[PDB]
Symmetry: D2
Subunit: 484 residues, 4 copies
Amino acid sequence: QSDTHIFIIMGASGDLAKKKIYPTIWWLFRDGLLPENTFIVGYARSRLTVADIRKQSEPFFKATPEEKLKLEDFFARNSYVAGQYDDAASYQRLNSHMNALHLGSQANRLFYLALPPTVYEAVTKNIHESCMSQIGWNRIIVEKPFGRDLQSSDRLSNHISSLFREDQIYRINHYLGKEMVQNLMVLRFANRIFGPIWNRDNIACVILTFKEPFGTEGRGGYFDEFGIIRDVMQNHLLQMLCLVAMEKPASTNSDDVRDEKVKVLKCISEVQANNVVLGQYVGNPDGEGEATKGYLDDPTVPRGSTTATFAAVVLYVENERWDGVPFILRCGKALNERKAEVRLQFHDVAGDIFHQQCKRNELVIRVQPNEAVYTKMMTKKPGMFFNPEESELDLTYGNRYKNVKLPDAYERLILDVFCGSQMHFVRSDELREAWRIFTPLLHQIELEKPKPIPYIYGSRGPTEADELMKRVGFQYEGTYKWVN
Amino acid sequence: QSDTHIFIIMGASGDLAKKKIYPTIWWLFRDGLLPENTFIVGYARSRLTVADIRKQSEPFFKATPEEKLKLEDFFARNSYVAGQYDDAASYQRLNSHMNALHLGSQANRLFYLALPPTVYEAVTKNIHESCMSQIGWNRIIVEKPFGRDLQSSDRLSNHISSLFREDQIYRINHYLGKEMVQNLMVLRFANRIFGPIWNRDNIACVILTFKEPFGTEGRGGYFDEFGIIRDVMQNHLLQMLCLVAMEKPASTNSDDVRDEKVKVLKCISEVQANNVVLGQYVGNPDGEGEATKGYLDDPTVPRGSTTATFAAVVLYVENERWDGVPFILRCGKALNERKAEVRLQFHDVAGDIFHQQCKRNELVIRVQPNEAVYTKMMTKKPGMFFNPEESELDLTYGNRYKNVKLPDAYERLILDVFCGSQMHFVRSDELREAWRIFTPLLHQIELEKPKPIPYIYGSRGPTEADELMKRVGFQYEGTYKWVN
Amino acid sequence: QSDTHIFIIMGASGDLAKKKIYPTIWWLFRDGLLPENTFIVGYARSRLTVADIRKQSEPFFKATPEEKLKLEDFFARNSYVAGQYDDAASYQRLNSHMNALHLGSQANRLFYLALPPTVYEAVTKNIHESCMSQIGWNRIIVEKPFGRDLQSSDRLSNHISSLFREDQIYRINHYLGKEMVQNLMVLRFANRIFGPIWNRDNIACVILTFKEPFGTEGRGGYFDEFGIIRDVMQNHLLQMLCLVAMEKPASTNSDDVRDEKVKVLKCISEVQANNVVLGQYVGNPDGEGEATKGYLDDPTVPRGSTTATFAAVVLYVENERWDGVPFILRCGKALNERKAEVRLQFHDVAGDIFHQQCKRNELVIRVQPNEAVYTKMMTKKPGMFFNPEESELDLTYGNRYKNVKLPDAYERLILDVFCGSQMHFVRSDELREAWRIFTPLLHQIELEKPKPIPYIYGSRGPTEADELMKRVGFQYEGTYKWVN
Amino acid sequence: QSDTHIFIIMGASGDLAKKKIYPTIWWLFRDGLLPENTFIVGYARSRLTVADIRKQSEPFFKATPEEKLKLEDFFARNSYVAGQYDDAASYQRLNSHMNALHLGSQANRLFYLALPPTVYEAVTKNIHESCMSQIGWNRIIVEKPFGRDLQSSDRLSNHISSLFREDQIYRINHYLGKEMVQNLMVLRFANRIFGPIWNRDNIACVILTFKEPFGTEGRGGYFDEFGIIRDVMQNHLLQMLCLVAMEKPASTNSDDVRDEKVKVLKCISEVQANNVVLGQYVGNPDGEGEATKGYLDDPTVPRGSTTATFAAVVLYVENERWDGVPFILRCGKALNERKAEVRLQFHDVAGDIFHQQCKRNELVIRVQPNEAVYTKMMTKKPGMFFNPEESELDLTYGNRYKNVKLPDAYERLILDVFCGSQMHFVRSDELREAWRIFTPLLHQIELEKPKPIPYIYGSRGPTEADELMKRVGFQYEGTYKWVN
Ligand SMILES: NC(=O)c1ccc[n+]([C@@H]2O[C@H](COP(=O)([O-])OP(=O)(O)OC[C@H]3O[C@@H](n4cnc5c(N)ncnc54)[C@H](OP(=O)(O)O)[C@@H]3O)[C@@H](O)[C@H]2O)c1
Ligand SMILES: NC(=O)c1ccc[n+]([C@@H]2O[C@H](COP(=O)([O-])OP(=O)(O)OC[C@H]3O[C@@H](n4cnc5c(N)ncnc54)[C@H](OP(=O)(O)O)[C@@H]3O)[C@@H](O)[C@H]2O)c1
Ligand SMILES: O=P(O)(O)OC[C@H]1O[C@@H](O)[C@H](O)[C@@H](O)[C@@H]1O
C-alpha cells in the first residue's frame, strides 16, 4: 500500500512558485520519484484556475513533445484554491476542498510556503490551527530569509517552533540540496585519504567563495534592505562551513549530522569589525549593457546607501580540530564570474627539501558551475625537469559522469521532504547560532554606516579583501596554470 | 668553459647497444642536453667502422629529414675502435685514440658496460688499470643482472667496489629512470595530503604489479637460467618498494635518498617458502600464433624445467611505519596485459556509517603505460542516489600534458650520469640487502624443484596468487567500473 | 543577597539517609560551603523528631568536641515532618511547614529521594503536584537503581521526565562524584600528552576493574534480584567507560559533556552472550568467618540460585576513535581486594627493536583506594644493564597532596546540586543507552538460567574470565613487580 | 675460552687518570664485570711505579676494609711503563713489556688516552705504527676536547681516522654514559605513550638545561681559552639534543643509532648571532668564600676578558618532525644550582575549554642530580575545587630503585668498549656537524669581542636569556609549586 501524498504551494501565483517550485515538482513527477497517489493544490490571493497557473508555468517546465500525456496527467493531479493569508474561512474552504480527494485524510500532508516573510506568522498559525492532518504526517516548508538579525529571527523561530516540532519544520537552504554540498559529507567521512588530514595540524586556512557576474539588475530594493552578508554569507557560506568543519556523526541520521553542525557553529566567536571588508560596485565606464551602471544607478536604491555588494569575513572555530585556522568567507555580487567554491589551503610541508619551490596544497570542491573535486597537488615537472610544479588530481562531473543528469537542488530537497530525510535542512539551534555570529557586525554596520571600498563592476572586488586574505595567513601566488 | 664529455660503449656492436644506447644518446644530443664538447667512442670485439654502426643504428634512431644535418654532426662526433675484453693492448689503444681528441686529457670519461655479466670483472679491472683520466671525473656504468644469488652477486659487487668509489658506480635499473617512479618522491614529499596518511595506521597492504602480455618467444634459455624472481622482483619491484616505503630524506641529495632506501631494505626479513606463488605458462588451445605455445613448447628451453614465469610474494618491512602491512609483489610474463602499477590499499574507514557500502581506498600510480595518478576514492553517486560509489581523482599524463613528451628512461638516466646525480642508481649495500631477502628462497627452489601452478597463456596467472592475496589481507571486490 | 536554600530529605528515617546523606550535609555545612540561609527538612513515615534523627545520626558524623557549637547550629537549622509517601495531606503539611521559615517562599527548594524504587512514582507525582516553589528553583534527586531492564527503567524515566525538566532531574551515580572519575576529563582534554594517543590507533584494549573483598555478607536477598551486572556494570563501569571514551566537549557546560557521553553510548553494540563470563562464589574451606560461606550458604538467598557475583564483559564502541578496541568491564564481589581501576593497555610499539623485551604500556587511573594515576612505562634497567624493564610514572594522592583531605563523593555531588552544575549526573537518554546495551543479555540470562563458573571465596574469580581477556586482545604477563 | 684483555691508560700519572680512570676500572674489576684474563698497563713520562700509582689513587678508590684481597689482586694485575709520547723506542719497549704477559699475543689490547689534545696526533701515530695487536682487536679511546672550531677539530679527526677505522675509535662524551641520557632511547622508542606526541605537531619548544653552582674556581686559564660554548654546549647539550630528536633506528646496532643522530645533526642550520645571550659572572658582594669573587677576580684569567660563562642558544631542526620548534640550549657556570635537565614544553591544548587555566605540559627528564622522569601535567585541583592545576607523573630513582646503585658513566663506557658496543660514542661526521653548527658564531664572537651581560655570582644568569626564551615561544609561568 502506497500512502497518498499531497503537495501544497503557498503563493502559487508568486514569482518563486511559478519559477522554481512547479517546474521542480513537474520534473520530479516526470521521473516517477513521487508516490503513486500524489495530488497538488495551489493557494494564493489571485483568483486563478489550474489553466491559468498552467499557462503561466509551462515555459519554465522545459517540456518536450514526448511528455504531453504525462503533462495532462500532472495537471489532472493539480488543483488551485483562492483565499487570503489571514482569513481563516479561506483555510476551512481549503481543508474542505483538501479532503475531497482520493484517500484525502490518510494522506501525508505537505505545505510549501513561497510567501514573503511578513506573513509567515499568520500563515503558519492558520495552518497549525486548521490544516493539520489527523492520520498522516504534516511537514511545513519555510523559505529564506529568516528574519533580519538575532532577535528578529529568534522571534520568528520561536513562533514557528511553538507551533510545529523540529521534525515537521523544513527550513530551505537550496545550496544544501546541491550535488557537491552533499558530496562534501561522503568525501569527508567515507575516505581515509581525507580523514587524518582534516584538522588544524594540516589545514592553513579555509576559503568559501561565492561569486556572481551580475548585480542587483534593477531589483535593488530588497538587496538594499538586506545586504550581501544577510543574503549569502549568513546561510550559504555558513552551511558550507558547517559541512566542512563538522565532526564525524554517529551515523547518517539527520539528527546526528545536525547535532555535529550546531556543535561546530557553537564554537565560533563573534565577528570583529576589523576582519570585515565591504564593497559597493559602481558602473564600469567601458562596460556593456548593464555593466555601465553601478549600484547607485539602480533607481530601486535610496540615495546615499552604504549597503555592500561584497564581503570577505574571517571566522574562527575555537575547538580542538579547528583552533587558529581562519575561515575566509568571501562573497560578492557584480563580480567577474559565477563560482561557488570550497577551498582548503593546506599548510606548507614540514622540512621543505625542494628549496622553497613547493607550494600549499589546495583541495578545491567547486559546487557550481562544472561540479568537480580537484586537489592542487605537487607533482614533478614532466620531461627533462626535476623541480615540482602545481598539478591537480581532478574528478569532474561532466567528463566522468556525462550520461547522468545532476538534478536541480529543489528536486532533491523536495524528494528528501517526501522521504522524511531532514539531514539537509536548517535547525532552529543552528539558525540561532548562525544569526548570533553575525548580529553584532550587522548592528554595528547599520548604526555606523561605514563607506564600502568602491570596486568597478565586473572586477574582482576591492583589493582590501585580498589584503585581508594575505593578512589572515592565506597565500596567493598566481602561478597555477591549468588547461582543460 | 664547458668540460669535454666522452660517452663510452663497451660492446658497441651488441644488441642492447644498437637497440637502446645509441638511439638514447642520439636523442640526448638532438635536444642539446649533452655538453657541447661531446665525443663518443665505440668498443667491441667485432672489427666495424663508424659507417657500419651508423647503418645498424639508423632504424632505431627515429630520424626525420629535417634532422639530417644534426645526424651528420652526431656521427662526426662518433668513433669506433675494436679490441678484446681481456687484452690490455686494446685498452691502451683506446686510451691513445681518446687522447687524440679535442682536449682528451681534461675530457671527462664516461663508461657504459653493455656486456654479458661474465666479463664484468675483466672489463672493470682493465678499465681501472688503463682507462682512467688523471684530471676529470670518471664514472662507469654496469648493467643488469647483478649476480645470481647473495654470494655470487656479492663477489662481483666487492670486486667492482674495490676498484671504483661509490660515486663512480652507476648500476642501471632503468625503472628508476621512468617518469612515474621518479615522480613518486614528489608525490609524497611535496604534498601534505599524502604525508600524514603514509603509514601502517592507514595502509592495509601495498601491491606492486608488473605484467607482460607476451612470453619469451625463443629467448627462453636466459629466462630458464634466471627466473622471473631474479629477473624483475629483485630489482624493479624491490626498488619501487624502496621508494614507496622510504622515509623522508634530509635533502634531495642522492646519498640521503639511498640511505633511507637501504634503511628500509634492512628492515625486511628473508622470504618464507609459504608466501610464494609460482606459475609456468602453457599454450592456449584457442590462442593466436605465439599464444598457442607454452613455456615447455620452446626448443631452446631444456626439457622438464620447473622455472616459473610468474611470482606473487609477500614482503614485510618491520619498522615503526610499515609494521604488519604486507607488500604483495605480483609479477608475471605471458599475462593478459602490460602494466607497471603501484597500488596502496588503505584500511577500512573506522566506524563505517554508510552500512558497509564503502570500500578500501587505493592510491594507484601506474608507471606504464598511460602514466596517471588516480586515488580510488568513495564519492556520492551522482543523481537521485545517496549511497557512495567508487570513483577516482585522476591526473593523467596525456590528457593534461599532451604537448609534453615524456622521455625514455635511458635518456634521463644517462643525463643524470652526465650531471653527476646518483639518486636513481643502485648502491652496493641495498643490492646486498635485496639479494639477502631473496637468496634463501632461490636456493630452496633450485634444490627442491617445486611444481609451479600451470596457467594458460594470456590468462591472469595462477589463482593461487589471488588466494594468497586474499589470505594476507588484500581485498578485491571487482565492482570498480571505470569509463574514460 | 544570599537566597534561601532548603534541603528536603525523603525517607529521613531511612538507612541510606542516616548513614550517608545527613553526615554529608553536616560535613558540607561544617566547612561553610552551603548558603548562609540554608535549612534542612526531614520526611519519612516514622514519627521521629529532630532529636531522634540527631541521636541516630551522631555516630556517622565523625564529629569532634570542638565542633559542638557548629553541630548545635546545624541541628537548630534541622527539622522533621512525619507523613506518607502517597497521602497528599502530608505533602501540603510539609509545604506549609517549609513555607513557615525565613524567606520560606523565595527559598530554593532541593529534594533528596532516599527511598526504595517502588515509591518513586508516588513521591515524584506528589512533589510535583504540591511541593514546588513559585519563585526559586526546584531540583529533585533520584537514586540507584533505575529499573531492572530497558522497559522497567524507561517507564520510570518517562514518568520522571513527564513531570520535571532535564535541568531539575538530578540522577545520582556516586561514582561520578569520585575524585579520579571527574579527574578523567582533566586528564583527557587538558593534557597534550594524553590527547593524540587516546584512540584506537594506540590503544589495544580497555579494562575497567571493580573488585570487592567481601561477598553479599547476609543481604543476598537484595543482590539476588539484581545481579552484579545490573548492580555495577550498567551504571558505574559504564559511566567510567563513557568518561574514558567521550569526545572533547565544546565547553565545560553540563549539556555538552552529557551530549558527548550519550553520543559515545550510542556507538556501543548490544552485548553478545559469547563475551560474558559469569561467576558465583563458593565458600572457602579454610577461610575466616565470612569467607567460609558461599553465595548459596546464605539463608535469604533463594535455593538453587544461579546469580553471578562476578562478570567480565567485552564492549565495542563502533566509531572512528574506538573501532575494534575491546572494552572489558571486569567486576566481581567476594574477590581478593577492593579496587576500582581504569586500565588502558596500549598496542605493541611498532617495529620493536628491543628483541621482544618490551611489553604493552598501560595507563592506569585507580579510582579507589589510594587515588593514583600511573603509566606502566618501559624504562632502561637501572644499573649495569641495557635491557628495559617495566616501570611506572606514578602520581599518588597521599604522597603529593597529603595535607589536603579527599572528600566523599556525596559531598561534592550535593554541592554540585546546590550550585546547579549538572555535569556529573546521568541523563535520561544515557540511561536508555546503558540499558539497551545490556537488556537482551540480562533477559537471555534470566530465561536460560546459565551456570556461573564457581570460584573460591577470596580468589580472583573464574579463570575463564582470564581466557576471555587474553582471547579479546589483552596480554597479561605477570612480570610487573612494584615496590612502594 | 675467555680471551685476554689489556687495559692501557696513557698518561696514567695525569690528573684525570688518577681521579677517574683508575677508580673506574677498579670498580669494574671489583664486580667481576671484566674478563678473568684482564691486565692493566700504565704509561706516562713520570717515573712512577705500581706502588706509587697505588698510593696516589687509593683515596679515590673509596675502598672498604672488606676488600683488601681484591685490591692486592687488582694491583697484582697492574703495571706501569715509563717513556715519552714522541720517542718510538718507548713504544717498542711498551710493546715488549705488554706482550710479556700471559697470552700477551692473542690479548685484546684496549687503549685509553688521558692526555692533553696537543699530543693526540703524535700518540696516535706512534701507537698505530708500533703498538697494534695482530690477533685480537684494538680499540683507541680519546677524550674531550676535540679541537676549538670546525677546521681544528677536522684536522685531528682526519688524522685519527686516517690511522684507525671507525669501529676502533671510541670518542668519549661521559654524559652519553649517564643513566638518563641512555634511558632517553628507551623512553622514546619503547613506549607508545611518548612516540606519537614526539613531533612538532605537539611540542612547542625544547629546553636542555645545564647549570653549575660553582665558577671556574681558580682554573680560569683553561676556561678562558674555550668558553662555555666549547665547554658544554658544543658536546653535552648538543648530543642530548641529537638523542632526543633522533628518528627511530632500524635496529639497536651502534651504526643505526649513530646514523640517526648524524641525520638529525644534518638538519640544523648555523647559529645566528641574534639568538645568543652571553653572560660573564661577577662577584656577589655578600657571598661566601668563592662567591665573593667574579670571573674577572681570578689572577690567571687575562685582564679584560670577555669570555662568557653562560649561554642561551636557540636551535632549529629543519626536518619533517621538528620544523619550527625552537631548541633552547641554556647552560652556565656559577649559577644557582647543579642540574642537567631535558625539558620538552608541549603546545597549548587546542580548543581549551577550561578558560585559560590550563598550562603547557612539560615532559621533564632530570639527568642529574636525583635522576627522575616527570611530566608536568594538568590535573584537577583536589577537594572542593574544579579548576585544573599543575602536577606531575613522577618516577624518581631513589624512591623506586633505592637499593640499586647507579654506576658512574665511565664504568659503563669502559664496559661498552670492552663488549664492543659503540652506541654511546661520537662519530667523526657527528663531530663535523656539531662543529659546523657553532663555528661561525664562535668566529664572530672571537673577532668582534662582545660584552656579555654581567650577572652576580649565584644568580640565574642574565635576564636577557629569559627574554630570548620568552620571545622564541617558551612560556614561563612560575606558578608550578612542588612539594616532596
Ligand atoms: N634488452 C636487452 O637486451 C637488455 C636489457 C637490459 C639489460 N641487458 C644487459 O646488457 C648487456 C648487453 O648484452 P646484450 O643484451 O646486448 O646481449 P649480447 O648481444 O649477447 O652481448 C652484447 C655484446 O657483448 C659481446 N658478447 C656477447 N657474448 C659474449 C661473451 N661470452 N663473451 C664476451 N663478449 C660477449 C658481444 O660483443 P661482439 O659483438 O664484439 O662480439 C656482443 O655484441 C647484457 O649483459 C644484458 O644482460 C640487456
Ligand atoms: N677532570 C678533568 O680534568 C677532565 C675531564 C674530562 C676530560 N679531560 C681531558 O682529559 C685529558 C687528561 O688531562 P688532565 O685533565 O689529566 O690534565 P693534565 O694533568 O695536565 O694531563 C695529564 C697528563 O698530561 C701530561 N702532560 C702534562 N703537560 C703536558 C704537556 N705540555 N705536553 C704533553 N703532556 C703533558 C702529563 O704527563 P706526565 O705526568 O707523565 O708528565 C699528565 O700526566 C685532557 O685532555 C682533558 O681535557 C679532563
Ligand atoms: O656533571 P659532570 O659530570 O661533573 O660534568 C661537568 C663538567 O663537564 C665537562 O665537560 C666540562 O668540561 C666541565 O667544565 C664540567 O664541570
